[PDB]
mmCIF file of N, CA, C and O in Angstrom:
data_model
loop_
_atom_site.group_PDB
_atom_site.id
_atom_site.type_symbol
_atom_site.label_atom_id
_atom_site.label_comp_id
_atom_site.label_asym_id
_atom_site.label_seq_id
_atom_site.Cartn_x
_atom_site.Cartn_y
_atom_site.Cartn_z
ATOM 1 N N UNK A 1 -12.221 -0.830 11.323
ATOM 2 C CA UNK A 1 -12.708 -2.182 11.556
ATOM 3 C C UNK A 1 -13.956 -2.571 10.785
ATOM 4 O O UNK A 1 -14.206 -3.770 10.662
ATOM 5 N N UNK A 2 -14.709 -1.719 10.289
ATOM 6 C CA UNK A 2 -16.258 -1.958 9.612
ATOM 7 C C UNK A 2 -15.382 -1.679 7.776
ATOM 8 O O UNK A 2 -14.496 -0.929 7.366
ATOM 9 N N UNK A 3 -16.372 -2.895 7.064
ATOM 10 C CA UNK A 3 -16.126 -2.775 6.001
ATOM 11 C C UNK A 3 -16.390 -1.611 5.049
ATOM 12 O O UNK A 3 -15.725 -1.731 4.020
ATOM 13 N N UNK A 4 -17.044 -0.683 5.075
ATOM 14 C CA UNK A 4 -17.019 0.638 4.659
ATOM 15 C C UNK A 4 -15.729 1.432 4.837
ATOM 16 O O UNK A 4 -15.193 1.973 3.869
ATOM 17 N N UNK A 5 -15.196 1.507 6.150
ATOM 18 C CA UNK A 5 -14.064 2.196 6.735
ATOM 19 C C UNK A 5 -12.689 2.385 5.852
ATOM 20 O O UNK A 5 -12.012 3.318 5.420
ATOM 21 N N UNK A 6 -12.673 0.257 5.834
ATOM 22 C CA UNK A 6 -11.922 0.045 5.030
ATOM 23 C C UNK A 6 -11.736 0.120 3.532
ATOM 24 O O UNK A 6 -10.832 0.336 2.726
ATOM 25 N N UNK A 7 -13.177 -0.194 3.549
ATOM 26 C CA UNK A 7 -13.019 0.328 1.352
ATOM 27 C C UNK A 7 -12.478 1.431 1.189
ATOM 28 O O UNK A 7 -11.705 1.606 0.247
ATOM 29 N N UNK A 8 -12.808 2.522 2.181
ATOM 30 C CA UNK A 8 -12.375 4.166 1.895
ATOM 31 C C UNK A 8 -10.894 4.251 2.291
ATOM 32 O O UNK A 8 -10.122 5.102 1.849
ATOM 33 N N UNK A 9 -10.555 3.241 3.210
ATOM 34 C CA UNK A 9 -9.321 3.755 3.624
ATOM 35 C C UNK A 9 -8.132 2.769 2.262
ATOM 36 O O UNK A 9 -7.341 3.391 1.552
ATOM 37 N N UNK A 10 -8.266 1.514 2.206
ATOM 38 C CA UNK A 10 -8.186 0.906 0.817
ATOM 39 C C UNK A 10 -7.916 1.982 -0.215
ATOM 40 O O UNK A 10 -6.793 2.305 -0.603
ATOM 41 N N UNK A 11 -9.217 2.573 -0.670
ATOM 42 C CA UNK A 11 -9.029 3.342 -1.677
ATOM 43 C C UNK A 11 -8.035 4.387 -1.932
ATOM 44 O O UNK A 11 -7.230 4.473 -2.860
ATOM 45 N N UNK A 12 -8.251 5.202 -0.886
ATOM 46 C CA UNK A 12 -7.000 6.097 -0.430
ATOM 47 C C UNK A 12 -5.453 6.018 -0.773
ATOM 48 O O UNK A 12 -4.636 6.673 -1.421
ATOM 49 N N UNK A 13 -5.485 4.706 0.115
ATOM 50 C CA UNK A 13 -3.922 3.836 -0.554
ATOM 51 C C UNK A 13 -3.807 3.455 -2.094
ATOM 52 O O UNK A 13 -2.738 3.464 -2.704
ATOM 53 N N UNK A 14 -5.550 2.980 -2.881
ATOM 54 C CA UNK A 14 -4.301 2.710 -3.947
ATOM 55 C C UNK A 14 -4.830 3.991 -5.019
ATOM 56 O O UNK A 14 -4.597 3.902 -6.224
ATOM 57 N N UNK A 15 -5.524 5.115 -4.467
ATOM 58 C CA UNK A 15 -5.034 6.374 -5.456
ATOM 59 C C UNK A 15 -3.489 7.150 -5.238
ATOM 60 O O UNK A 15 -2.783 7.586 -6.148
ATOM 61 N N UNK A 16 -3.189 7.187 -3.761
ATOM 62 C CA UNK A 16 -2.013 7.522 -3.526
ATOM 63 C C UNK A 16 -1.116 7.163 -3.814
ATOM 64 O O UNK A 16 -0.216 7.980 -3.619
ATOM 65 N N UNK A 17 -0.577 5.585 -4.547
ATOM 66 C CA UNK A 17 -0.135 4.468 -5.317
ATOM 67 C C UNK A 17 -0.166 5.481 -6.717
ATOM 68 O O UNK A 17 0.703 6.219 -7.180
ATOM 69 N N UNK A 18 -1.720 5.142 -7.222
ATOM 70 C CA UNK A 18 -1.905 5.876 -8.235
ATOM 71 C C UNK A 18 -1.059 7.267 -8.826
ATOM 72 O O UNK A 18 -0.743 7.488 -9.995
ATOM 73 N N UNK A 19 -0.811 8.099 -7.645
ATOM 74 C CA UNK A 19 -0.485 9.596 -7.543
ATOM 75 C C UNK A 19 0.925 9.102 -7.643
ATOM 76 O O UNK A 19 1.098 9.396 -8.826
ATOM 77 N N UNK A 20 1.820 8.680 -7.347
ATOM 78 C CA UNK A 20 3.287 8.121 -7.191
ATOM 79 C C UNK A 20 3.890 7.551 -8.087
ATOM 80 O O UNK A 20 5.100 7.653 -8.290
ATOM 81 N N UNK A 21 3.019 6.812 -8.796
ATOM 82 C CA UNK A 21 3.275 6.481 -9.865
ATOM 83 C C UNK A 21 3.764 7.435 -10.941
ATOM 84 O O UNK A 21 4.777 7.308 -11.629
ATOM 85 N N UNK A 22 2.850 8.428 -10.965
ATOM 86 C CA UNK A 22 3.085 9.645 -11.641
ATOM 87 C C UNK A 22 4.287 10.551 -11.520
ATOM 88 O O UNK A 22 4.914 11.131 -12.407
ATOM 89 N N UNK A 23 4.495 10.531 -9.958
ATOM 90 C CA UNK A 23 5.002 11.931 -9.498
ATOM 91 C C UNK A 23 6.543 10.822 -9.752
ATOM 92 O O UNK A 23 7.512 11.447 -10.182
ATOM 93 N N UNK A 24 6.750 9.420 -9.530
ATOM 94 C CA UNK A 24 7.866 9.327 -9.986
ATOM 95 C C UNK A 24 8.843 9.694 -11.365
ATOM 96 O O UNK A 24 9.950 10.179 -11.599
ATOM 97 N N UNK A 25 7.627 9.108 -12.134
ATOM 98 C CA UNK A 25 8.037 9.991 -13.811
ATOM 99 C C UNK A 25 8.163 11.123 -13.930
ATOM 100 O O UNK A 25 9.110 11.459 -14.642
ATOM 101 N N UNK A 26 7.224 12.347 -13.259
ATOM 102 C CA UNK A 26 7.485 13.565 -13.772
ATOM 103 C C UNK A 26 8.458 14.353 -12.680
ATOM 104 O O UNK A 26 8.845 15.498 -12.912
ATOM 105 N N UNK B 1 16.141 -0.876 -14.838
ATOM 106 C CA UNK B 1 15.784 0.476 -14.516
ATOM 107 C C UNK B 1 14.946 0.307 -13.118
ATOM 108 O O UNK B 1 13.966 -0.389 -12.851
ATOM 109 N N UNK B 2 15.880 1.412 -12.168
ATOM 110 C CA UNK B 2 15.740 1.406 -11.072
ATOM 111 C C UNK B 2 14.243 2.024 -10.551
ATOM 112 O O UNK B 2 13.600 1.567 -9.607
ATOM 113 N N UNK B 3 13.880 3.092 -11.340
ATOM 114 C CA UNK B 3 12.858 3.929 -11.354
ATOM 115 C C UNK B 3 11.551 3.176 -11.856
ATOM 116 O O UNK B 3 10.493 3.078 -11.234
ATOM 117 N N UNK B 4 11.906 2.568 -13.347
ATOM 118 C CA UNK B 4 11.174 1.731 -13.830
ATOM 119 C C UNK B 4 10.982 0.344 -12.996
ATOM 120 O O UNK B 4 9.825 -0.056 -13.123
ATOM 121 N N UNK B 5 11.713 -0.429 -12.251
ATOM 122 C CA UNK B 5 11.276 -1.486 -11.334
ATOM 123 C C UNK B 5 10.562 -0.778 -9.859
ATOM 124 O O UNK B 5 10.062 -1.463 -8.967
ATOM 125 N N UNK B 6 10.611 0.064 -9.853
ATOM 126 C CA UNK B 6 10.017 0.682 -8.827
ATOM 127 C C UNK B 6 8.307 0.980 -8.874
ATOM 128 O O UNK B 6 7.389 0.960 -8.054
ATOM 129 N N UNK B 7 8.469 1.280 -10.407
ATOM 130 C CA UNK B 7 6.772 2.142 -10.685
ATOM 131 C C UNK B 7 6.020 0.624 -10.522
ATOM 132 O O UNK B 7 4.888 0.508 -10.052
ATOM 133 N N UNK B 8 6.857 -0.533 -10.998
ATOM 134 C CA UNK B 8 6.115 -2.026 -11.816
ATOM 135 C C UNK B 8 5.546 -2.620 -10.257
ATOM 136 O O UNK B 8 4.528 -3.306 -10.163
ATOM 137 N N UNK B 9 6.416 -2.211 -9.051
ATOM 138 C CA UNK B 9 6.426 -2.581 -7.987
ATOM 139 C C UNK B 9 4.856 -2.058 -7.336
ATOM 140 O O UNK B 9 3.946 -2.744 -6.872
ATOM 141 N N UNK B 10 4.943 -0.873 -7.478
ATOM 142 C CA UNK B 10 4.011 -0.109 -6.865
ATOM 143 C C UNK B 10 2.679 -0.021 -7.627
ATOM 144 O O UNK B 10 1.630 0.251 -7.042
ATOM 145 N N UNK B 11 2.732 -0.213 -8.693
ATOM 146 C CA UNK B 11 1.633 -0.554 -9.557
ATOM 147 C C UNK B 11 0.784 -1.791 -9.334
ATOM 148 O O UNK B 11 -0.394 -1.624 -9.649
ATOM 149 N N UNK B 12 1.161 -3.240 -8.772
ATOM 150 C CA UNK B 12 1.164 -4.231 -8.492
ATOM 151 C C UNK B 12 0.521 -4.232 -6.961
ATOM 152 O O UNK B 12 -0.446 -4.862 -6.531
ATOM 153 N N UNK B 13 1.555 -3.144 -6.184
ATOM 154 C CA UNK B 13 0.295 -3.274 -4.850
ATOM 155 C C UNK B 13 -1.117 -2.054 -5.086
ATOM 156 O O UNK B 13 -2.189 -2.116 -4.484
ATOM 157 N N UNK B 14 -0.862 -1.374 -5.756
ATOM 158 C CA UNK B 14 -2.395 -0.626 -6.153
ATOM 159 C C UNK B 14 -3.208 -2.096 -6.996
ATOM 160 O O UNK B 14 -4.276 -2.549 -6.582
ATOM 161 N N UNK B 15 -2.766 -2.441 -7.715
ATOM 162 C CA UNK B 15 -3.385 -3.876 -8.378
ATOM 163 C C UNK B 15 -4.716 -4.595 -7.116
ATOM 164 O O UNK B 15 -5.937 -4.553 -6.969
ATOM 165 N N UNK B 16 -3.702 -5.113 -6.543
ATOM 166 C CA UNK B 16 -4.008 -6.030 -5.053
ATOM 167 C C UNK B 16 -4.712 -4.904 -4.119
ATOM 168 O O UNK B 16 -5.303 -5.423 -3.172
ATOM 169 N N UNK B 17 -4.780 -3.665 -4.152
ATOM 170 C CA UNK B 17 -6.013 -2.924 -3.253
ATOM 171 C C UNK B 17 -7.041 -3.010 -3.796
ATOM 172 O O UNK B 17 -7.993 -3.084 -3.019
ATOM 173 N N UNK B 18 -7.383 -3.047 -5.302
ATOM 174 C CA UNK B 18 -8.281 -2.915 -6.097
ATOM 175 C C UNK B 18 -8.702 -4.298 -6.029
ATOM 176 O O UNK B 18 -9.920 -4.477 -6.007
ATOM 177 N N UNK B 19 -8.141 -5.054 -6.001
ATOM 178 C CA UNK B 19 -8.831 -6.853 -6.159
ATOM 179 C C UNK B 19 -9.493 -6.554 -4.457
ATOM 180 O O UNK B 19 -10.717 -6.447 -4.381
ATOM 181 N N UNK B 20 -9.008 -6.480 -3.693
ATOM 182 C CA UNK B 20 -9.207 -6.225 -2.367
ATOM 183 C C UNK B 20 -10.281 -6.026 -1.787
ATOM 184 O O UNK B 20 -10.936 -6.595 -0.913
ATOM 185 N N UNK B 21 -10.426 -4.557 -2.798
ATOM 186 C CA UNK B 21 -11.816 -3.588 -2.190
ATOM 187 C C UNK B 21 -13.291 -4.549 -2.941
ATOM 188 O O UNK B 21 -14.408 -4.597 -2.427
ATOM 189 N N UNK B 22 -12.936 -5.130 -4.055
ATOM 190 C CA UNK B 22 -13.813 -5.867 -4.739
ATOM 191 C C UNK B 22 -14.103 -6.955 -3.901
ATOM 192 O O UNK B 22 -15.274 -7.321 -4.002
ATOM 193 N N UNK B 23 -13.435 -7.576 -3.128
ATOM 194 C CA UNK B 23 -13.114 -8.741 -2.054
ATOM 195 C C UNK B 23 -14.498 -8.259 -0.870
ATOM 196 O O UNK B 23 -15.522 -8.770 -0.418
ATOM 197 N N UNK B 24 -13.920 -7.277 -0.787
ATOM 198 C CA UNK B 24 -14.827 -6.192 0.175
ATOM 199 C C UNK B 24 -15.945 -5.991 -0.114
ATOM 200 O O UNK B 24 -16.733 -6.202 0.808
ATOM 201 N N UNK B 25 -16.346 -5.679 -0.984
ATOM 202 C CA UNK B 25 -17.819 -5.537 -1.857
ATOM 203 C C UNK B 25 -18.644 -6.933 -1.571
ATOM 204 O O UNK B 25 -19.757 -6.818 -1.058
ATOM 205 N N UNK B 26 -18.214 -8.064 -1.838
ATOM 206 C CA UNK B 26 -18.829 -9.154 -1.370
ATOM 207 C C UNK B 26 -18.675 -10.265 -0.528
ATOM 208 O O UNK B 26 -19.594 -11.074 -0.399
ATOM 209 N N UNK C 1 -11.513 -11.341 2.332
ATOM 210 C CA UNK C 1 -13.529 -10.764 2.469
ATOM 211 C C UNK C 1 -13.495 -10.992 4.391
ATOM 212 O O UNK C 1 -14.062 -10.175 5.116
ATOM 213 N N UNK C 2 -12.923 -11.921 4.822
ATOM 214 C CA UNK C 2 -12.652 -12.280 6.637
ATOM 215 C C UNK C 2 -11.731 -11.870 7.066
ATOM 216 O O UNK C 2 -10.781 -11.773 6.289
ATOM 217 N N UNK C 3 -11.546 -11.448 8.421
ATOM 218 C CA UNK C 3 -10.614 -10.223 9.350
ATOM 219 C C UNK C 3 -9.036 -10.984 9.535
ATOM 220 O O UNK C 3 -8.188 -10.246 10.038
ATOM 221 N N UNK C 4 -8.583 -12.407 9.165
ATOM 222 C CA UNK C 4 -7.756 -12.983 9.090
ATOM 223 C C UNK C 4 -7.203 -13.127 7.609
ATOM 224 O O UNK C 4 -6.049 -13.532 7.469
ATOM 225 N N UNK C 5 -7.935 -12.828 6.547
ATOM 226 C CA UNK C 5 -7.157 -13.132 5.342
ATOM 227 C C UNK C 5 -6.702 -11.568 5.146
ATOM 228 O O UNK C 5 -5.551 -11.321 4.784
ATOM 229 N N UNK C 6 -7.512 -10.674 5.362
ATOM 230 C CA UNK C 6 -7.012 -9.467 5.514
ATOM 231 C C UNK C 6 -5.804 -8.779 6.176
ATOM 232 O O UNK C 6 -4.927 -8.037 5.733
ATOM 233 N N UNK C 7 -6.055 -9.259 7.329
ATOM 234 C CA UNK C 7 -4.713 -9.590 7.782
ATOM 235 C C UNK C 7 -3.706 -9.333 7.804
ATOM 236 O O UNK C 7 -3.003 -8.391 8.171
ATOM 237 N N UNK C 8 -3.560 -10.732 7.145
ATOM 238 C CA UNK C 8 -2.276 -11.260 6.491
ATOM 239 C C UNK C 8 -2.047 -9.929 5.126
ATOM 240 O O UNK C 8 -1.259 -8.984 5.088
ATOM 241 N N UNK C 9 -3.066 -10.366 4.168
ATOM 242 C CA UNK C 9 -2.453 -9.541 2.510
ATOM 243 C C UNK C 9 -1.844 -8.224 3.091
ATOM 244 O O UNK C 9 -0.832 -7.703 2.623
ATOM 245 N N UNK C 10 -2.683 -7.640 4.352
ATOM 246 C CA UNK C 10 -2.105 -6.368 4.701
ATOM 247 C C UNK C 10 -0.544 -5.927 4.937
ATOM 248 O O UNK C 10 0.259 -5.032 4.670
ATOM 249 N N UNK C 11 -0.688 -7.308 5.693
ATOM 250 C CA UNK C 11 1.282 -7.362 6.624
ATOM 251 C C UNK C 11 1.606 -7.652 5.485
ATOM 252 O O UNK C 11 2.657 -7.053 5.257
ATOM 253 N N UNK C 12 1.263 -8.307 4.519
ATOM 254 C CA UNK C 12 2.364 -8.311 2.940
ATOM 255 C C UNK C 12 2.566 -7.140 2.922
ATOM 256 O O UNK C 12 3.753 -6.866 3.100
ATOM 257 N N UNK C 13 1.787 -6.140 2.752
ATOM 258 C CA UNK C 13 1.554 -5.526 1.625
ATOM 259 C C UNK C 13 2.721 -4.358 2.612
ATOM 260 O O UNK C 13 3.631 -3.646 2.188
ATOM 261 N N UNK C 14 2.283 -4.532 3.829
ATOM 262 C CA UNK C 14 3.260 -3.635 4.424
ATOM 263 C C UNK C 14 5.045 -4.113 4.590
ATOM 264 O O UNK C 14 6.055 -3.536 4.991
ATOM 265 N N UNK C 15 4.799 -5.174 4.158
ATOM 266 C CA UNK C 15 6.253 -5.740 4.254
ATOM 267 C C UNK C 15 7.109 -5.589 2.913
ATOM 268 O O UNK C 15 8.308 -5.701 2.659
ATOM 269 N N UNK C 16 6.118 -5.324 2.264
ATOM 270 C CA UNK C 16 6.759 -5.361 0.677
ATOM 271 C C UNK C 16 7.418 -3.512 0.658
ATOM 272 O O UNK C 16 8.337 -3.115 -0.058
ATOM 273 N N UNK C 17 6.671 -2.722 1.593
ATOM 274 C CA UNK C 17 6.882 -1.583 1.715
ATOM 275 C C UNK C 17 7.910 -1.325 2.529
ATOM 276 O O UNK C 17 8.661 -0.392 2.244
ATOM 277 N N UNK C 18 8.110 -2.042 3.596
ATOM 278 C CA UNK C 18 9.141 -1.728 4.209
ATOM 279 C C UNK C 18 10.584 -2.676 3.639
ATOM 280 O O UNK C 18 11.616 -2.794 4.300
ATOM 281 N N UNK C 19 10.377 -3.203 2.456
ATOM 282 C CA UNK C 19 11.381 -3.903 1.847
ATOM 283 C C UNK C 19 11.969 -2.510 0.361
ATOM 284 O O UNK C 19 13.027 -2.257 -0.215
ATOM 285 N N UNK C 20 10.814 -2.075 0.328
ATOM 286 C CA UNK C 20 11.165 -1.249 -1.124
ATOM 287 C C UNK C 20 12.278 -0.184 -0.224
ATOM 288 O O UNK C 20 13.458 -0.019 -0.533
ATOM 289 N N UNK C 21 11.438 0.596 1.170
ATOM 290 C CA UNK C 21 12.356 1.813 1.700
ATOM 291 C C UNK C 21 13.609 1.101 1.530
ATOM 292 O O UNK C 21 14.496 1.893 1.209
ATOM 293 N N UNK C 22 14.044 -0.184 1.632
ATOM 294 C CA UNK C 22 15.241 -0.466 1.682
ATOM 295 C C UNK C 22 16.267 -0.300 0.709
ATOM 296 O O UNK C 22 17.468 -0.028 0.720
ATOM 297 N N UNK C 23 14.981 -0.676 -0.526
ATOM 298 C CA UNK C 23 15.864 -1.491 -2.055
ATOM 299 C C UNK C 23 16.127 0.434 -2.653
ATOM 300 O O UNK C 23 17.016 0.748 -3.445
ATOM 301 N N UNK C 24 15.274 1.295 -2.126
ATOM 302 C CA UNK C 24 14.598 2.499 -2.961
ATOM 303 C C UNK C 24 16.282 2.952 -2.425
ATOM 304 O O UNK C 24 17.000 3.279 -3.370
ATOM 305 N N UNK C 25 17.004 3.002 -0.923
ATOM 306 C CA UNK C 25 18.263 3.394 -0.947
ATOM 307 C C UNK C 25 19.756 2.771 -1.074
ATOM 308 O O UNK C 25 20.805 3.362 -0.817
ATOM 309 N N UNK C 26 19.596 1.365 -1.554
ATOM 310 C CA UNK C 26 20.649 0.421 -2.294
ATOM 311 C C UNK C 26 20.771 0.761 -3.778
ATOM 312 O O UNK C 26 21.544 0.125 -4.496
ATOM 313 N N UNK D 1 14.485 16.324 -2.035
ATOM 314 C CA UNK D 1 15.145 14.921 -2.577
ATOM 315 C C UNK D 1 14.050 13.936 -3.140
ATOM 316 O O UNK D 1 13.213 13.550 -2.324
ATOM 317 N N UNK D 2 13.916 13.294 -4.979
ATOM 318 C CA UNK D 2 12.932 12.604 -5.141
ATOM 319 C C UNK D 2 13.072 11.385 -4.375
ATOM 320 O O UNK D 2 12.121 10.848 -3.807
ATOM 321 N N UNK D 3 14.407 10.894 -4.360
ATOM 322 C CA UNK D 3 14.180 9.491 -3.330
ATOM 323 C C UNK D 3 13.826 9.413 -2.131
ATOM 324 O O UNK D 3 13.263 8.475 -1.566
ATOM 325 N N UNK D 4 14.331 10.946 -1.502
ATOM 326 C CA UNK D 4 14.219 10.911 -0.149
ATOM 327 C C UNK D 4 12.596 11.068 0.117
ATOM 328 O O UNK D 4 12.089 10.420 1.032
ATOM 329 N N UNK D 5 11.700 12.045 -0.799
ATOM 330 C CA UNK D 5 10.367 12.188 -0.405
ATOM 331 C C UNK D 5 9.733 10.890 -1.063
ATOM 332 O O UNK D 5 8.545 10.638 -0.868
ATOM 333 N N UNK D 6 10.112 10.501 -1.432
ATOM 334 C CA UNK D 6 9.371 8.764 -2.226
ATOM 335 C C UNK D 6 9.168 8.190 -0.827
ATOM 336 O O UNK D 6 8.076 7.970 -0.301
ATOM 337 N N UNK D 7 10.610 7.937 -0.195
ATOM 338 C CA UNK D 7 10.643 6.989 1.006
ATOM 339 C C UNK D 7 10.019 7.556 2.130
ATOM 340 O O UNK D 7 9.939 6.888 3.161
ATOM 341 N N UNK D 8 9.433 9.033 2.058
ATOM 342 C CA UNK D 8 8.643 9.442 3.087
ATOM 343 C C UNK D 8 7.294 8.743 2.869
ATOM 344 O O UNK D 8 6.700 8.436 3.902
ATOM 345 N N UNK D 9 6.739 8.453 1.758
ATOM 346 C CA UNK D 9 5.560 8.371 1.486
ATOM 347 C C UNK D 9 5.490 6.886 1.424
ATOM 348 O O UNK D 9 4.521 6.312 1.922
ATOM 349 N N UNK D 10 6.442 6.230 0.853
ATOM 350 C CA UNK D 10 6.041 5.044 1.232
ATOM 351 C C UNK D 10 6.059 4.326 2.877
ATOM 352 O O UNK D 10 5.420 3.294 3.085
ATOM 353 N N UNK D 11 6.808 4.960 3.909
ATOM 354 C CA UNK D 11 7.024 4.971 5.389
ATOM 355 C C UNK D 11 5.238 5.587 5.571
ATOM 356 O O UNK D 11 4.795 4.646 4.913
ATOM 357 N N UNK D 12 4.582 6.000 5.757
ATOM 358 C CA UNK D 12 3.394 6.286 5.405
ATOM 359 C C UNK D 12 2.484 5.752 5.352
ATOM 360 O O UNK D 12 1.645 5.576 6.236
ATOM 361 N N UNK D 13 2.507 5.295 3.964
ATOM 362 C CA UNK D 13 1.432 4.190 3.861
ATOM 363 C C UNK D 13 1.981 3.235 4.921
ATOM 364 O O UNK D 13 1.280 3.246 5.933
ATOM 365 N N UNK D 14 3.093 2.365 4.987
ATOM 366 C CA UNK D 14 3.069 1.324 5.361
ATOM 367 C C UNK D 14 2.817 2.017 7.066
ATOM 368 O O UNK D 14 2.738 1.039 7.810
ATOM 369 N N UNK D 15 2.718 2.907 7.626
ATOM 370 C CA UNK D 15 2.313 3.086 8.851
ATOM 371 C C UNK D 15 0.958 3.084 9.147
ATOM 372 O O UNK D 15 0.404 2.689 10.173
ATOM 373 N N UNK D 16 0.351 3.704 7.859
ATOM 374 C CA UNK D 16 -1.212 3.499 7.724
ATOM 375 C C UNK D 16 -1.980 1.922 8.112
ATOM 376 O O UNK D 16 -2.809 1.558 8.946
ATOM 377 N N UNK D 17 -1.007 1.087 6.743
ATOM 378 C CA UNK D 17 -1.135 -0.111 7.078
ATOM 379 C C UNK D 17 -1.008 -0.830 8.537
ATOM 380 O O UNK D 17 -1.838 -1.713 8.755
ATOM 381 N N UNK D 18 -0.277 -0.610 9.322
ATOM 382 C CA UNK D 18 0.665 -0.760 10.770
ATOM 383 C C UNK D 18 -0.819 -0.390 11.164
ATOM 384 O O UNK D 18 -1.052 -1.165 12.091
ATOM 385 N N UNK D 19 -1.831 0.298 10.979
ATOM 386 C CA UNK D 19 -2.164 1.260 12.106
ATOM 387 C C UNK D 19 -3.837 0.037 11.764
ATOM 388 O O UNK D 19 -4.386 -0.715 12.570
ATOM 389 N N UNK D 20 -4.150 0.273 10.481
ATOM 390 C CA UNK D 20 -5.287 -0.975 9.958
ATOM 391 C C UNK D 20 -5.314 -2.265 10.588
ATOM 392 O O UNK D 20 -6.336 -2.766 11.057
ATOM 393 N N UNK D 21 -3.662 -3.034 10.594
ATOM 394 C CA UNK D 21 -3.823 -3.907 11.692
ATOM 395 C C UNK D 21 -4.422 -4.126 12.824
ATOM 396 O O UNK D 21 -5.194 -5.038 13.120
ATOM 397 N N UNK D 22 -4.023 -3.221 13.473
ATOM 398 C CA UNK D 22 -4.376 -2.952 15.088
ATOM 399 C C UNK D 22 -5.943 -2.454 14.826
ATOM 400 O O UNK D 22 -6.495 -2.189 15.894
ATOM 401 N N UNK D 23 -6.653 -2.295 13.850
ATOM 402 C CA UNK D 23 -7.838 -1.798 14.014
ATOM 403 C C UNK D 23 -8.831 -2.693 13.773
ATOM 404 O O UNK D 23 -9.978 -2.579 14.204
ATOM 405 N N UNK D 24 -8.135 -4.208 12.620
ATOM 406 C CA UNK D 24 -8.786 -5.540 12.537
ATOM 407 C C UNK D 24 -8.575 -6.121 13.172
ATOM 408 O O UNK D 24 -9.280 -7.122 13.046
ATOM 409 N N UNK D 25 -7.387 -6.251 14.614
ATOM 410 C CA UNK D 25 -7.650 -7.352 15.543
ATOM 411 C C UNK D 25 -8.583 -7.154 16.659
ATOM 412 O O UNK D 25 -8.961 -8.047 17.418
ATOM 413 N N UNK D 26 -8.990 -5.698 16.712
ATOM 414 C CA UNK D 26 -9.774 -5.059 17.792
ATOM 415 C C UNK D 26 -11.131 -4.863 17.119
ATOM 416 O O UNK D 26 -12.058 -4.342 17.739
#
């Protein structure tokens, strides 16, 4: 609920995005 | 390409976390 | 940047996800 | 299975998301 929380939790999602991206190609 | 409309997909919501967290910042 | 526009982009963002599990096994 | 563990991970996030909701209306 606090905007910190969410930047980190945000972030999380779009490295894991990030990571998938990958792991689909290889 | 099924794989390839997939990555374009998911690339697009990492896009929109990143505009997001910037959203967040101010 | 407010707990209502957030929201919303979120339930997109989760709807777009629960649209891909779909398209990912068609 | 790559499709099958794709669709684990995207069920996932979007539960994450599911779960962020309930944490911005409260």
């Amino acid at each position: 609920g606090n905007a910190d929380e969410x930047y980190k939790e945000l972030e999380d999602x779009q490295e894991r995005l990030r990571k998938x991206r990958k792991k689909l190609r290889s």
